[PDB]
């Protein structure tokens, strides 16, 4: 058995920076696209493109990376059985353009956990990020699963939660993915956050968490689409960290360009 | 008549470092992938693999600029008419992808031109780069004219050319390319090098040279893909410098990630 673990794909808050909402979206609310980077549209939300702010969509590279990742498996004969994300709307897109590389996007039904999404710690302010239910996902076009029935939900989720909390339910949560999935299908795939690779598969391997300023310089150096293998042996039962089936993806940047500044 | 100048796309020589060869070759000089940015073939050269030293070959997610730019000027149905590039391989591939973009490799073919190679103080050593021939190129799938004559062949490139030297063979060029494609078409695209957006359209405009130590530090702001737009104003007959008819193109990186050096 194979429980893959990836980071979801670019995100556009932070290509965009700190106004990016002025740059996708007009006067009236409606969407609007300022640079090549930029999907064609966005989803409706409840409240309004303000929504976004909190929950950034990802951006037409993003897409890109978790296509070539999709592809990657498709080619090195890896089947996927079941696939889970975090509620964020970044995940489920990059788990969505994940299956379309992998050729099965008309097939396979995304599970929405919120006991995936990423230490609350870093969502501003004092309330969760206005996620779109999976119902809208699925209107939207993403292949997600509108009956699955979530381990954590989000109501689950504290904002004021400790570091031990978010590992504990990281551990907690897979568990359950992996019952839930165990003897029907040998690999599962958690398209989730920077944090979960670790926090998903540390305690599951036997071993202590770091402390949370050793993760968190950890956090940092895990870019678009990390992807990471942790193997249940079956000599033994124990899970460990091994050789993804599929290769690392590595690029660089395409900088900001203003003709007029520069060659004028 | 609008004469279109972009750069390249993503180099394979600046993601993967000094040692690049070795992540792409190997002791066979046979290519290998080693990251799912590295496309799946590269062309064999005469000289073998270290010809590519000089001249590294655009990467997976470069096609992809490429062709996000070729599918903007279709989608903003921005018609060209004729295709140009520089000898280095790096700029045919992306004139190559362009084109997939465009819908048009199936019917333009690129013309290869060394007069559009960069400033020759930017090649290390006392040679050139031993650049792939047209006839070589459409070999390797990459829609260039073989019929092509060139204004400035590659042996009347100078190894030691000065700065003004560059300039003024840029210029000459260019107008060489205009006056061919007179009445031919109204729009030109070339695709070139950072250098090429400025010392294809200075002395076109009237404008006088920058020092070069100016320009140098201009051309470290141009990012792969960008584009600029030079324009004969109707009522004059001057050509000036105006908004390119597609959005720019944005997005940052993907750093390299060890699993092991990071999670375990």
Not at 77 to 85: K, L, R
Request: hydrophobic share 35%; aromatic share 10%.
């Amino acid at each position: 058995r194979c429980l893959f673990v990836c980071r979801h794909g670019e995100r556009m808050d932070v290509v965009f920076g700190k106004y990016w909402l002025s740059q996708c979206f007009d006067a009236k609310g409606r969407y609007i696209r300022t640079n090549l980077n930029m999907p064609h549209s966005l989803p409706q939300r409840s409240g309004g493109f303000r929504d976004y702010e909190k929950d950034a969509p990802i951006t037409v590279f993003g897409c890109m990376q978790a296509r070539l990742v999709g592809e990657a498996l498709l080619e090195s004969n890896t089947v996927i059985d079941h696939v889970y994300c975090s509620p964020s709307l970044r995940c489920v897109q990059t788990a969505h353009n994940i299956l379309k590389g992998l050729q099965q996007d008309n097939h396979l039904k995304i599970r929405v956990e919120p006991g995936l999404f990423e230490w609350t710690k870093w969502v501003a302010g004092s309330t969760l990020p206005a996620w779109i239910p999976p119902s809208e996902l699925a209107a939207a076009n993403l292949s997600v699963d509108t009956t699955y029935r979530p381990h954590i939900p989000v109501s689950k989720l504290a904002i004021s939660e400790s570091y031990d909390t978010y590992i504990n339910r990281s551990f907690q949560v897979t568990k359950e993915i992996i019952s839930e999935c165990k003897s029907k299908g040998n690999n599962i795939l958690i398209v989730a956050h920077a944090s979960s690779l670790e926090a998903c598969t540390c305690q599951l391997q036997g071993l202590s968490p770091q402390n949370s300023k050793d993760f968190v310089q950890m956090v940092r150096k895990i870019p678009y689409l990390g992807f990471c293998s942790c193997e249940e042996l079956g000599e033994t039962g124990i899970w460990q960290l091994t050789d993804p089936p599929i290769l690392p993806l590595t690029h660089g940047p395409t900088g900001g360009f203003n003709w007029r500044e520069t060659l004028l």
